[PDB]
């Protein structure tokens, strides 16, 4: 249904060890599709998904120029942030930026984003109106006045409403065999005795895409959300994801427990039970 | 595709 395009950027200064490290990656939904690393041999933006390789060399030239320019801007901005926060030149600091757009099933803009962070904390963010700013502190208010004077929000709005949406739709069409394919979870339940009295039931979901999933345990149709241990959804390494949910159960009572799986790749939700 | 960043902090 709904889709997103995001570009992520990290610059990390390293005083005494050369210029800051700069790494940026682009995502459509949960799929990484481009990458640039300043520390790589002859840095260029590189493809990481098959559907983006069909773009011509002028695409990769422009992308690489933009990345190199961002790395340069970050070097200057990191020096400025030292002044804004009365910091010494000896420490390592981190500058992060994300921007992108969400589009709905009808292919129109749902929301645009552009936000920056310094040393892991919010610095300045474009508001949902794509016309105003939220500054985190008095330093970021200095940036906010500069950006209001230079009409930065109007420049971002043009991109987020226009190019961001148009190029996302292009990618979704060229990558439709993967980006518009939901892979359903392969599911099973395993049984792990703790003692003579109790056992862990673990409900597994493997090999699904996209990462969004809901796993819950029920006993006689009552949600055991209080007693369920969930792991964070984790990448399998092959584009797909994994997750499990576990409950501790009185031995001999396993058949009272059902695991419920919801994912966009499934016709209808699944219910599983432990099978001896 | 990416947006040119043309502003400083």
């Amino acid at each position: 249904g709904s889709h997103s395009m995001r570009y992520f950027h990290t610059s990390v200064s390293r005083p005494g060890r050369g210029e800051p490290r700069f790494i940026t990656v682009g995502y459509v939904d949960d799929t990484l599709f481009v990458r640039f690393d300043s520390d790589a041999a002859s840095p260029r933006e590189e493809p990481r998904a098959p559907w983006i390789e069909q773009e011509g060399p002028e695409y990769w030239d422009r992308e690489t120029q933009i990345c190199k320019a961002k790395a340069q801007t970050d070097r200057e901005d990191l020096r400025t942030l030292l002044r804004y926060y009365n910091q010494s030149e000896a420490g390592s600091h981190t500058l992060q930026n994300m921007y992108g757009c969400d589009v709905g099933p009808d292919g129109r803009l749902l929301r645009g984003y552009h936000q920056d962070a310094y040393d892991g904390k919010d610095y300045i963010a474009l508001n949902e109106d794509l016309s105003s700013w939220t500054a985190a502190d008095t330093a970021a208010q200095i940036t906010q006045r500069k950006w209001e004077a230079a009409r930065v929000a109007e420049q971002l709005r043009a991109y987020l409403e226009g190019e961001c949406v148009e190029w996302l739709r292009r990618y979704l069409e060229n990558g439709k065999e993967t980006l518009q394919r939901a892979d359903p979870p392969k599911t099973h339940v395993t049984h792990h005795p703790i003692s003579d009295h109790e056992a862990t039931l673990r409900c597994w979901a493997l090999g699904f895409y996209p990462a969004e999933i809901t796993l819950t345990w029920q006993r006689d149709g009552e949600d055991q959300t209080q007693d369920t241990e969930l792991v964070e959804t984790r990448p399998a390494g092959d584009r797909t994801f994994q997750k499990w949910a576990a409950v501790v159960v009185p031995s001999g009572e396993e058949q009272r427990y059902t695991c419920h799986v919801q994912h966009e790749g499934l016709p209808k939700p699944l219910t599983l039970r432990w099978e001896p | 595709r990416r947006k040119w960043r043309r502003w400083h902090l």
Partner: protein, 100 residues
């Protein structure tokens, strides 16, 4: 200057079958700053050919990384992930339990 300690998961790409090729994964997430050292161990020795994903981050700005390598699980061999980060006094070692 916020600091966040990594969360760590060690797991295989596919359910483990002894003698069949697989991928061992060490997923580190939720940490800040981004400098981190991750080793995959086999019986306590560092595995040499380990690949890792490119640095990305979540909505709360915290980083995540995937380290992985091909392996063939046996009933005898013991695998683990060792993580050092500025937020940890000593490196943290997490053993691969195939049931998790």
């Amino acid at each position: 200057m916020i600091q966040r300690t990594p969360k760590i998961q060690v797991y295989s790409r596919h359910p483990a079958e002894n003698g069949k090729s697989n991928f061992l994964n060490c997923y580190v997430s939720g940490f800040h700053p981004s400098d981190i050292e991750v080793d995959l161990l086999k019986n306590g020795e560092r595995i040499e050919k380990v690949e890792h994903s490119d640095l990305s981050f979540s909505k709360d700005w915290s980083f995540y990384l995937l380290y992985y390598t091909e392996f063939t699980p046996t009933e005898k061999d013991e695998y683990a992930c060792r993580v050092n980060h500025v937020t940890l006094s000593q490196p943290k070692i997490v053993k691969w339990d195939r049931d998790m």
